[PDB]
Design an enzyme around this catalytic site. Structure first.
Site, mmCIF file in Angstrom:
data_model
loop_
_atom_site.group_PDB
_atom_site.id
_atom_site.type_symbol
_atom_site.label_atom_id
_atom_site.label_comp_id
_atom_site.label_asym_id
_atom_site.label_seq_id
_atom_site.Cartn_x
_atom_site.Cartn_y
_atom_site.Cartn_z
ATOM 1 N N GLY A 63 0.962 -0.986 0.115
ATOM 2 C CA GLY A 63 0.013 -0.024 0.065
ATOM 3 C C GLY A 63 0.914 1.293 0.044
ATOM 4 O O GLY A 63 2.036 1.260 -0.441
ATOM 5 N N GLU A 93 -17.631 11.269 2.051
ATOM 6 C CA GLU A 93 -17.109 11.089 0.730
ATOM 7 C C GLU A 93 -18.051 10.156 -0.081
ATOM 8 O O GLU A 93 -18.653 10.251 -1.261
ATOM 9 C CB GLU A 93 -15.722 10.944 0.322
ATOM 10 C CG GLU A 93 -14.757 12.043 0.840
ATOM 11 C CD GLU A 93 -13.371 11.887 0.462
ATOM 12 O OE1 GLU A 93 -12.640 10.912 0.324
ATOM 13 O OE2 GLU A 93 -12.842 12.857 -0.389
ATOM 14 N N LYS A 116 -8.247 18.501 -5.092
ATOM 15 C CA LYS A 116 -8.189 17.299 -5.003
ATOM 16 C C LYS A 116 -7.648 16.288 -5.951
ATOM 17 O O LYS A 116 -6.786 15.549 -5.748
ATOM 18 C CB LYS A 116 -9.525 16.536 -4.589
ATOM 19 C CG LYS A 116 -9.568 15.290 -3.765
ATOM 20 C CD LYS A 116 -10.992 14.931 -3.462
ATOM 21 C CE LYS A 116 -11.096 13.590 -2.699
ATOM 22 N NZ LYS A 116 -9.984 13.183 -1.710
HETATM 23 C C1 LIG Z 1 -12.825 5.943 0.752
HETATM 24 C C2 LIG Z 1 -11.533 6.583 1.354
HETATM 25 C C3 LIG Z 1 -10.962 7.673 1.165
HETATM 26 C C4 LIG Z 1 -9.818 8.203 1.890
HETATM 27 N N1 LIG Z 1 -9.318 9.528 1.515
HETATM 28 C C5 LIG Z 1 -8.217 10.025 1.889
HETATM 29 C C6 LIG Z 1 -7.605 11.186 1.349
HETATM 30 O O1 LIG Z 1 -8.455 11.889 0.776
HETATM 31 N N2 LIG Z 1 -6.479 11.581 1.961
HETATM 32 C C7 LIG Z 1 -5.965 10.785 2.865
HETATM 33 O O2 LIG Z 1 -4.818 11.043 3.142
HETATM 34 N N3 LIG Z 1 -5.930 9.487 3.250
HETATM 35 C C8 LIG Z 1 -7.489 9.205 2.882
HETATM 36 N N4 LIG Z 1 -7.785 7.893 2.995
HETATM 37 C C9 LIG Z 1 -6.878 7.026 4.106
HETATM 38 C C10 LIG Z 1 -5.925 6.289 3.431
HETATM 39 O O3 LIG Z 1 -6.792 5.606 2.328
HETATM 40 C C11 LIG Z 1 -5.185 5.277 4.245
HETATM 41 O O4 LIG Z 1 -4.673 6.308 5.325
HETATM 42 C C12 LIG Z 1 -4.092 4.502 3.511
HETATM 43 O O5 LIG Z 1 -4.658 3.624 2.676
HETATM 44 C C13 LIG Z 1 -3.013 3.927 4.488
HETATM 45 O O6 LIG Z 1 -2.067 3.307 3.714
HETATM 46 P P1 LIG Z 1 -1.255 2.042 4.119
HETATM 47 O O7 LIG Z 1 -0.331 1.701 2.798
HETATM 48 O O8 LIG Z 1 -0.854 2.168 5.270
HETATM 49 O O9 LIG Z 1 -2.326 1.009 4.080
HETATM 50 P P2 LIG Z 1 -3.497 0.456 2.610
HETATM 51 O O10 LIG Z 1 -3.816 1.588 1.716
HETATM 52 O O11 LIG Z 1 -4.572 -0.202 3.599
HETATM 53 O O12 LIG Z 1 -2.656 -0.814 2.074
HETATM 54 C C14 LIG Z 1 -2.171 -1.800 2.529
HETATM 55 C C15 LIG Z 1 -1.933 -2.961 1.532
HETATM 56 O O13 LIG Z 1 -1.979 -4.184 2.535
HETATM 57 C C16 LIG Z 1 -2.062 -5.299 1.745
HETATM 58 N N5 LIG Z 1 -2.715 -6.075 2.732
HETATM 59 C C17 LIG Z 1 -3.137 -6.087 4.028
HETATM 60 N N6 LIG Z 1 -3.133 -7.288 4.716
HETATM 61 C C18 LIG Z 1 -2.387 -7.998 4.139
HETATM 62 C C19 LIG Z 1 -1.784 -9.217 4.429
HETATM 63 N N7 LIG Z 1 -2.322 -10.090 5.409
HETATM 64 N N8 LIG Z 1 -1.033 -9.776 3.373
HETATM 65 C C20 LIG Z 1 -0.845 -9.164 2.231
HETATM 66 N N9 LIG Z 1 -1.160 -8.120 1.866
HETATM 67 C C21 LIG Z 1 -2.033 -7.279 2.736
HETATM 68 C C22 LIG Z 1 -3.304 -4.707 0.989
HETATM 69 O O14 LIG Z 1 -3.493 -5.353 -0.377
HETATM 70 C C23 LIG Z 1 -2.828 -3.109 0.628
HETATM 71 O O15 LIG Z 1 -1.897 -3.566 -0.589
HETATM 72 C C24 LIG Z 1 -8.839 7.146 2.719
HETATM 73 C C25 LIG Z 1 -9.487 5.850 2.869
HETATM 74 C C26 LIG Z 1 -10.337 5.560 2.304
HETATM 75 C C27 LIG Z 1 -11.233 4.305 2.771
#
Ligand SMILES: Cc1cc2nc3c(=O)[nH]c(=O)nc-3n(C[C@H](O)[C@H](O)[C@H](O)COP(=O)(O)OP(=O)(O)OC[C@H]3O[C@@H](n4cnc5c(N)ncnc54)[C@H](O)[C@@H]3O)c2cc1C
Ligand SMILES: Cc1cc2nc3c(=O)[nH]c(=O)nc-3n(C[C@H](O)[C@H](O)[C@H](O)COP(=O)(O)OP(=O)(O)OC[C@H]3O[C@@H](n4cnc5c(N)ncnc54)[C@H](O)[C@@H]3O)c2cc1C
Lengths: 395, 395
Positions: free
Chosen positions: B10, B167, B374
């Protein structure tokens, strides 16, 4: 074996620690000293390196060099909060649990929400911050010869003509000749402006001294603006109120010495505080906690001679230390506690490296004499913490 | 062969990986990236496909297409546990050993123990899941013309009126006219109900924006129920508390946006967590482990400047990435690390495809302007990870 945790290796904490060290011996208790840096700084000398009249290494000393590491475990880290319920202190890189807690995290600046002051003025409160001031000032002077129109580079505004403000401008004023020579600046263009909101310089002090000070400092180019509050502060200078009307000062350097409050961590940890400070009980403990001692600028004590607080000073902080150390040893060895008895002697305010004012042993003092007293008085503290080795090392 | 393992492709993981890729050269280390799918999804766009306002392929990109396989070995598989003692990660179809570990396994839904919420409400948290929401909703609308009494098929409940909830309802509201035409439904029967437990919509935001949002969304048929918690959730809808009466809402669709927590694998692997998240040290490492970095929604960081935690966002996650990549390159080369500093700029909340609210560069923004910002802001990230090829490929 009880755990003693001392937060802050300043006047209070260090003195508390070194006391415990002389009063106890191995295995009586766990003593952990926490400081953000591995050095302890002579806070009362910080105005000199700020102005560049004394190298900063002379205003600090290594903590390990002072203590017996068998007796005291020193931790370099930064306190974030205190959990009173759980007797845990949360650090930036870990946690500590205590039976006894000594809090000596000193002051932080108070800008009274005056606009910009926080973001755009400097403070004299650490070794880091005085090196920054000092180098900032030299940079401005270096820039000048190439832009002789920008006399604002040569204008330094000092907010507050209290003890610290005066000491600082005095140091600045001594330094100007050397500085002007180093950077080919015409001394007559330099402007050191001390700006005080109250109707007099050194409000609270004996006018005989005030006048003598104003006279010496005026005689070296210090301008005083009194009854003049700072309405706001910007990267370009300050706005002040003269005769109910806004006047600007263009100044590339602005330093605030106008107010301090108790380190904010004390309030955020949920202690009840007045101006960030704790009104301690007679053994210097925090109300509600028979096992938490507060020292130095974190502690508020009302003076019985008047009914006004004692001001936050190193002198009293040192005494807090000695008391808490004696009283903690007592606690540990089933001895008895002695309540705290401030014995406030006199203080001298320096006026550059060669002149000074103060009241010692009931009597006013000036010039070369006053200077030596301050130096001697200050050496007492070095001796207290590091014996002759140290007194000589400041040689 | 210093082995670096990155768990989760992610925002945090991918950005960490693409950093390491730019900063190191061949054979400096083993870099293994693990993700459950072979694509990376733009989590922040997932509300659109969920409502059907944008095809889901526009919100994902193939991982292999982004990385250099010579530099990074990509593994498609599902993490099950982390053994800290052994430095082994257990996958569904194998195991991996690491010297350095980066954890970016994102969030899981937090249902606060509310009955049924986990099993009967949808979450907007993957490509799979938004396709399911989207097709579920359409199925209900299709069923309606044949059972016009079942207006519950036209009722959609969204739990939580935070950033995501708003949203999403905004997207749902834009889509309704098309959806009603596709399925011969009377718009006046459709009910989008946003249910928030807290006393206001968008708790924590500037009321000027909140009100503007409530006005636009109300104008498009969104109903808000505030100060209204969900007592339970069933296949038939939700039970809420109004005053003190338990009141039912019959709704064939329920979506929970009301809270997230750190992926549960972190806690169950025995790290100490708050809300499933790790309170990382200043270099983003897990306390007690000098070789484990946590990123994105798994990591908790306190805002010294309000003493409350930073919210789990893509913006900060991206920055975690860059820092961990830089710092790991350092570690690999016996170099020194730079601590982390969040630079939080502003964010815009969309309100359907053509309206939006937000604070950018200190100033509030609305409507067409806010929308474009945005969109541009979001393209920056695509550019960051896949350059102009990508920004164009989404065009
Ligand atoms: C609808 C929506 C709108 C949003 N809008 C905004 C915004 O406008 N601005 C902003 O800053 N933030 C926003 N966010 C928040 C942002 O999406 C998250 O903070 C962000 O995705 C966190 O990034 P990350 O890589 O920590 O986790 P994620 O984006 O959740 O990525 C996690 C990754 O881990 C993988 N995965 C999970 N568990 C496992 C496992 N056990 N094995 C292998 N793979 C795994 C998944 O496939 C994914 O690829 C929004 C969230 C949502 C739901
Ligand atoms: C220029 C100047 C001149 C002065 N001259 C005099 C004088 O002549 N006579 C006099 O009596 N008083 C004077 N004072 C006042 C005196 O310096 C203070 O009252 C005294 O320093 C208070 O001591 P303290 O031990 O409480 O705090 P400090 O001396 O401020 O020590 C606090 C210690 O805690 C550490 N620290 C703070 N916060 C954290 C954290 N979150 N985590 C970890 N560590 C932390 C700091 O690094 C420091 O080591 C002067 C002050 C100034 C600025």
């Amino acid at each position: 074996k009880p755990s003693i945790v001392i937060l802050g290796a300043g006047y209070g904490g260090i003195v508390a620690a070194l006391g415990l060290q002389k009063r106890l011996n191995y295995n009586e208790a766990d003593i952990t000293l926490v400081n953000k840096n591995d050095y302890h700084y002579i806070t009362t000398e910080l105005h000199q390196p700020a102005a560049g009249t004394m190298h900063h290494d002379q205003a600090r000393v290594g903590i390990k060099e002072l203590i017996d590491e068998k007796k005291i475990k020193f931790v370099k880290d930064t306190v974030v909060a205190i959990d009173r319920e759980q007797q845990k202190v949360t650090l930036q890189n870990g946690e500590l649990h205590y039976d006894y807690l000594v809090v000596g995290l000193g002051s932080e600046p108070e800008t009274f929400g005056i606009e910009g002051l926080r973001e755009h003025a400097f403070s004299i409160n650490s070794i880091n911050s005085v090196r920054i001031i000092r180098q900032h000032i030299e940079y401005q002077f270096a820039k000048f010869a190439a832009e002789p129109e920008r006399t604002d580079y040569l204008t330094i505004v000092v907010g507050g003509a209290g003890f610290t403000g005066i000491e600082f401008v005095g140091e600045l004023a001594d330094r100007m000749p050397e500085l002007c020579a180093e950077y080919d600046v015409d001394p007559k263009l330099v402007r050191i402006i001390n700006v005080e909101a109250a109707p007099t310089v050194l409000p609270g002090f004996d006018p005989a001294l005030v006048n003598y000070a104003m006279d010496v400092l005026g005689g070296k180019g210090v301008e005083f603006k009194i009854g003049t509050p700072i309405k706001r502060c910007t990267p370009e200078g300050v706005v002040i109120e003269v005769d109910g009307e806004e006047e600007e000062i263009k100044a590339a350097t602005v330093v605030w010495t106008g107010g301090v409050r108790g380190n904010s961590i004390v309030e955020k940890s949920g202690f009840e505080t007045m101006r960030g400070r704790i009104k301690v009980d007679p053994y210097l403990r925090a109300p509600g906690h028979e096992n938490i001692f507060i020292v130095g600028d974190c502690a508020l004590i009302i003076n019985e001679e008047n009914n006004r607080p004692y001001p936050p000073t190193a002198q009293i902080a040192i005494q807090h230390g000695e008391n808490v150390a004696a009283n903690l040893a007592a606690l540990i060895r089933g001895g008895s506690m002695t309540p705290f008895k401030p014995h406030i002697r006199g203080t001298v305010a320096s006026l550059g490296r060669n002149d000074a004012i103060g009241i010692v042993g009931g009597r006013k003092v000036y010039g070369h004499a006053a200077s030596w007293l301050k130096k001697l008085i200050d050496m007492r503290y070095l001796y207290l913490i590091g014996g002759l080795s140290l007194v000589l090392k400041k040689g």
